[PDB]
């Protein structure tokens, strides 16, 4: 019929790419299809695995003859859900269309119906897909068994629509589909390489196809491995084919396709380049150049990360085992975002203080009332699942319930965190870091003695006490941030001034800051316990608050030429106003 | 049935395309692909998705395009004729079929279909089961023809999940707001049509000011579309508004007025004369609210920074949290704030929005239910009133899920409901209040001489409110207890509120200065704040007057005097009638 396209007819005339691999998965389909009862195969796989290719490829074997005798005359038809629902405008009209196609196929023997995205039509309740209650017109044919149907449902939907419904599950044979191995991915592209080469009229290099798959899966982090490779290869050929007006380069290179991935990934070409060793070698020089202070703390972190990326040790274990421990306001948070920005991995911030209540711990694994909402899953699990290359920043870990510490111990040992929904998350490529603002109270604690001059200077001991000895064994090394120097604080003040100057440029108002003014801001905006945290408020109240009063009315409305000074006797800031 | 965009370019029907060089490179790159050779220009309303498709044809004729695209001609589907012209069955099939043969046999020919979402929901006269989408589906899969589409963000997602086969064939292309420099240039190209229709001339400065004034005040529409509305209306205003003089030229003062009308902001706002209102807002709050001068200064200072421009434009006008003891008027200052500025006050009591299911109503209800048509209360309220005050009283009582919504508002500044209707918070001030600070030690210190062992402030607020949410707040304005001196001023206003009530009954109330002091000290409670003063004024003044008003001399109306007796230390009421 017009709704469905005959895959066998299409394969006979060409236009269908060949299927490479998937022998073990494809053979399972032939096994269940030949069954007398419960012969409806179900292709449960994640998006991009190539579920449709397995169905299209199966038809190629029938026309070619590489199937049993029973499957010789078999014909596979792909149902177009869009054609049925389109133009109905009446709940039930869609059902009438399905019956006509079903009756036609039921008459002919040895007929199969490849229902793509079957989950859309059989959704339990209101859905954003088919929006049709096709449960009524799906169980009868499945129960009758006259015509067998192939369903390309996703792993998520299968766990809810098929599992909950006994009729669907009892008349469907699950066929697990997994992503192919990296070595298998290149073989798939090599087989399909001539088709794309003949179209673009360009020849791809063997090194490009191999390197493209490695950087595609890591930098894009959007789709699955099979879809990325086919997309980048097609994208690369198109770009080089029309890059110059007259010139052209039939050959391809790794550096050429790297620029293409930058656009779809929205990352600079330098980071997208396969130069992880180069960035790792100069990791300390980059962080020290981007941020100042805590040089000793930063240098120790680079040596440890190099040990994990070398490949030694157990691969299942997590790559990141670092426990930051120092006063806040010294840039402890900034190194976590700068490290991710340089390496290209994403940044995931999970504040432990919010996850303080015992009940809140459960949210990480799953929402308490989320029975209908199984798509979101656990808060921690979903972030890791979507982003397998991202830094995890845990703040105020010292103030957490005891059960929370055990959750971290499990991943540090096995490297895999299970989910109640059943999703499998891997921390092998996820770096884990946590900060603790402990020991600062002990240092700032006023001594009970008469002289009060007693200093502790042993805050590291308190860190080991707040954490159990078991946790200390798992972590290889802990990072310690030393107290900042008054000279370093002056550079932090300039950072806020630069941002203020840029904001004023849009209005044509200048800002001059004296060297003596910076000293007042540094002392006022720096606290021993909070570090540079008050600097944001101190800069705003001292500089921005009065400015707005004059900017709203006064000489500063136009002309700019702002000037700031401080009286030496009273040590108070006075800002001169010029028109 | 169709129109040749390439031929239209030669005649000049389509104005020269300005900018969008990166977008064109992305469209042509994906277009030449072996698979996914159908670009989709997803964008918002008025961004220029159709103009980009039409602009491409201009580049084809001029030859700027790579030679791969040279010799190609773009066509457009006659959406109007196909939807309604071919009402009868058979005609739609035979006429469309002819276009397929014309599309094929010429690889250089590329079709364009504006509003491609329409063909998905096609219409059938007698349910023939044949539509434009199914007819082109085999062709697109084979790749013999290439097409270009256009749709909305909310509509693009609606059809993406519903149909995966069509989504696979099409490649999404993100569109962004053009730069201000790009916007003024296009208006010059479109100037001959608008200026000639109204018989006026637009100044060069007006074009630049129009785009700047629009984005500053008008945030519902998009910059490219905004400029056309303020320009088309500006010329119309000069044609009908100056009926006596009929000014031919357009001045900068003209367009700014049109922006104010379209933006629904008080006149002279574009002139910036409203600075006086913010300049003297402080004094009005001081007289209305006593004992909170320090708190009013922090709130007033923060508001000035937003309007002054010393802040992030995406960030809202303000985000403050009011915490303190009961009766400090932390919610009274929010109410009076709206009256001073004149903007509408949006009150959202959080006691009602306490459950997870109830919090959903803030951003909208799920689809497929009776409450789908209701929409989002918070989104609808802020969209109707862009310049308004959003009051979230007793936020601590609300479920923690509501904080997730507030975290987004303070970060991005925009909130979109389930339906897809975006809401802007740039001109709305966020003023939330909490009663966590009310807790304090009621018992006094143990000892012969008491001590002021007051509990610390903000300690309990750290555990109740998450750190990330706490930091996002611009400033947490604390409210101090009302001292004995401040209570004297509070009583004075309560008598005024009582005097106006008596004015409707013909009774004039005169209270002595000594009487005011007795009422203040009688009910001055630090923990209860200002509420006891109402009960003191109620029990001592309203109760006797009410008895006389119903059964007494005050039935008609008259003067009354209140004075305390030194010997008895009790108020004495005299009625003159």
């Amino acid at each position: 019929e017009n709704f469905t396209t005959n895959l066998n007819q299409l394969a006979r005339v060409g236009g269908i790419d060949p299927l490479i691999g998937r022998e073990k998965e494809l053979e399972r389909a032939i096994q269940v299809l030949c069954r007398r009862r419960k012969n409806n195969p179900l292709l449960v796989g994640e998006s991009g695995v190539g579920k449709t290719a397995i169905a299209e490829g199966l038809a190629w074997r029938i026309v070619q003859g590489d199937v049993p005798e029973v499957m010789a005359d078999c014909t596979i038809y792909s149902l177009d859900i869009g054609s049925l629902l389109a133009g109905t405008k009446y709940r039930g009209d869609f059902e009438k269309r399905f019956k006509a196609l079903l009756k036609q196929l039921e008459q002919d023997t040895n007929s199969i119906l490849f229902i793509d995205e079957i989950h859309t039509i059989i959704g339990a309740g209101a859905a954003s897909g088919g929006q049709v209650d096709a449960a009524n017109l799906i169980k009868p044919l499945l129960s009758s068994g006259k015509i067998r149907v192939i369903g390309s449902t996703t792993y998520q939907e299968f766990s809810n629509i098929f599992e909950k419904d006994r009729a669907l599950a009892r008349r469907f044979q699950k066929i697990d589909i997994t992503e192919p191995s990296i070595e298998e991915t290149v073989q798939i592209i090599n087989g399909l390489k001539p088709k794309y080469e003949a179209h673009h009229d360009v020849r791809y290099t063997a090194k490009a196809v191999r390197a493209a798959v490695e950087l595609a899966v890591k930098y894009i982090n959007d789709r699955h491995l099979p879809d990325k490779a086919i997309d980048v290869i097609d994208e690369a050929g198109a770009r080089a084919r029309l890059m110059p007006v007259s010139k052209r380069k039939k050959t391809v290179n790794v550096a050429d396709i790297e620029s293409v991935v930058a656009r779809i990934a929205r990352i600079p070409e330098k980071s997208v380049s396969q130069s992880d060793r180069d960035t790792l070698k100069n990791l300390g020089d980059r962080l020290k150049m981007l941020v100042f202070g805590q040089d000793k703390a930063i240098e120790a972190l680079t040596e440890a990360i190099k040990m994990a990326r070398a490949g030694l040790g157990h691969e299942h274990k997590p790559v990141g085992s670092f426990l930051f421990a120092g006063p806040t306001g010294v840039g402890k948070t900034e190194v976590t975002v700068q490290l991710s920005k340089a390496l290209g991995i994403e940044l995931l911030r999970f504040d432990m203080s919010e996850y303080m209540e015992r009940h809140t711990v459960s949210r990480l694994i799953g929402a308490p009332p989320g029975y209908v909402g199984f798509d979101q899953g656990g808060l921690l699990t979903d972030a890791v699942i979507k982003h397998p290359h991202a830094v995890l920043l845990l703040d105020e870990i010292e103030k957490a319930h005891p059960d929370v510490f055990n959750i971290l111990l499990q991943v540090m040992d096995n490297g895999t965190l299970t989910d109640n929904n059943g999703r499998k998350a891997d921390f092998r490529n996820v770096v884990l870091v946590m900060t603790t603002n402990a020991g600062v109270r002990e240092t700032e604690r006023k001594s009970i003695g008469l002289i009060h001059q007693d200093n502790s200077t042993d805050a590291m001991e308190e860190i080991k006490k707040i954490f159990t000895p078991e946790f200390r064994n798992r972590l290889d090394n802990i990072i310690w941030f030393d107290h900042l120097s008054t000279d370093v604080i002056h550079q932090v003040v300039d950072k806020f001034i630069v941002e203020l100057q840029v904001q004023l440029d849009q209005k044509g108002v200048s800002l001059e800051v004296s060297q003596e003014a910076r000293n007042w801001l540094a002392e006022k905006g720096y606290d021993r316990a909070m570090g540079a945290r008050p600097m944001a408020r101190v800069i705003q109240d001292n500089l921005k608050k009065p400015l707005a009063n004059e900017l709203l009315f006064g000489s500063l409305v136009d002309g700019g030429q702002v000037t700031v000074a401080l009286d030496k006797e009273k040590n108070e800031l006075t800002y001169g106003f010029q028109s | 049935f169709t129109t040749n965009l390439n031929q239209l370019a030669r005649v000049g029907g389509i104005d020269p395309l300005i900018g969008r060089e990166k977008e064109l490179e992305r469209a042509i790159q994906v277009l030449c692909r072996r698979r996914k050779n159908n670009p989709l220009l997803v964008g918002e309303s008025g961004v220029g998705k159709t103009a980009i498709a039409e602009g491409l044809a201009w580049r084809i004729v001029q030859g700027d395009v790579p030679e791969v695209m040279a010799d190609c001609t773009i066509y457009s589907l006659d959406i109007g004729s196909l939807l309604a012209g071919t009402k009868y069955r058979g005609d739609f099939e035979k006429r469309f079929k002819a276009l397929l043969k014309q599309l094929e046999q010429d690889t250089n020919s590329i079709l364009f279909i504006d509003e491609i979402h329409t063909i998905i929901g096609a219409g059938a006269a007698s349910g023939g089961q044949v539509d434009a989408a199914n007819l082109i589906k085999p062709l697109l899969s084979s790749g013999k023809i290439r097409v270009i589409g256009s749709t909305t963000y909310q509509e693009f997602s609606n059809i993406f999940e519903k149909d995966r086969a069509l989504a696979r064939r099409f490649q999404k292309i993100d569109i962004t707001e053009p730069s201000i420099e790009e916007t003024v240039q296009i208006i010059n190209g479109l100037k001959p049509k608008y200026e000639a229709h109204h018989d006026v001339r637009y100044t060069a400065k007006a074009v630049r000011a129009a785009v700047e004034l629009a984005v500053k005040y008008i945030n519902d529409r998009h910059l490219p579309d905004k400029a056309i509305d303020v320009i088309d209306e500006a010329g119309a205003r000069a044609r009908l508004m100056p009926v006596s003089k009929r000014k031919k030229t357009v001045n900068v003062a003209d367009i700014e007025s049109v922006v104010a009308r379209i933006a629904r902001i008080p006149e002279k706002s574009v002139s910036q004369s409203d600075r006086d209102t913010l300049k003297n807002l402080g004094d009005r709050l001081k007289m209305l609210v006593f004992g909170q001068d320090k708190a009013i200064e922090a709130l007033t200072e923060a508001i000035k920074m937003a309007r002054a421009g010393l802040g992030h434009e995406h960030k809202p006008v303000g985000s403050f949290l009011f915490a303190g003891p009961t009766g400090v008027g932390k919610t009274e200052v929010t109410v009076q704030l709206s009256k001073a500025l004149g903007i509408e006050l949006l009150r959202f009591d959080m006691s009602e929005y306490m459950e997870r299911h109830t919090v959903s109503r803030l951003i909208g209800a799920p689809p497929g239910y009776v409450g789908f048509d209701q929409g989002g209360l918070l989104t609808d309220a802020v969209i109707k009133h862009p310049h308004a005050v959003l009051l979230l009283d007793e936020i601590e009582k609300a479920h923690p899920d509501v904080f997730n919504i507030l975290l987004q508002v303070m970060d991005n500044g925009t909130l979109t409901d389930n339906n897809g209707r975006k809401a802007d918070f740039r001109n709305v001030v966020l003023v939330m209040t909490t009663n966590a600070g009310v807790r304090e030690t009621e018992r006094k210190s143990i000892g012969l001489i008491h001590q002021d062992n007051s509990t610390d402030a903000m300690e309990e607020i750290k555990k109740i409110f998450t750190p990330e949410f706490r930091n996002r707040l611009d400033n947490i304005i604390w409210f101090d207890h009302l001292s004995t001196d401040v209570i004297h001023q509070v009583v004075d206003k309560f008598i005024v509120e009582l005097q106006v009530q008596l004015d409707q009954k013909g009774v004039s109330l005169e209270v002595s200065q000594e009487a005011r002091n007795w009422l203040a000290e009688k009910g001055y409670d630090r923990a209860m704040g200002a509420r006891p003063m109402a009960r003191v004024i109620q029990d001592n003044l309203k109760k006797p007057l009410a008895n006389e008003l119903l059964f007494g001399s005050l039935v008609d109306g008259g003067q009354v005097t209140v004075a305390l007796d030194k010997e008895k230390n009790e108020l004495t009421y005299g009625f003159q009638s």
């Binding site: 009446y90 709940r91 309740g125 209101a126 009940h359 308490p368 009332p369 029975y371 209908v372 | 299911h357 497929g368 239910y369 009776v370």
Partner: peptide, 25 residues
């Protein structure tokens, strides 16, 4: 004792639509 948990029940909405007829002549 641990706190209790309450589960809500959402009701689906579906309605029937009448049909008017137009005679040709």
């Amino acid at each position: 004792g641990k706190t209790n948990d309450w589960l809500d029940f959402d009701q689906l909405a579906e309605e029937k639509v009448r049909d008017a007829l137009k005679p040709p002549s």
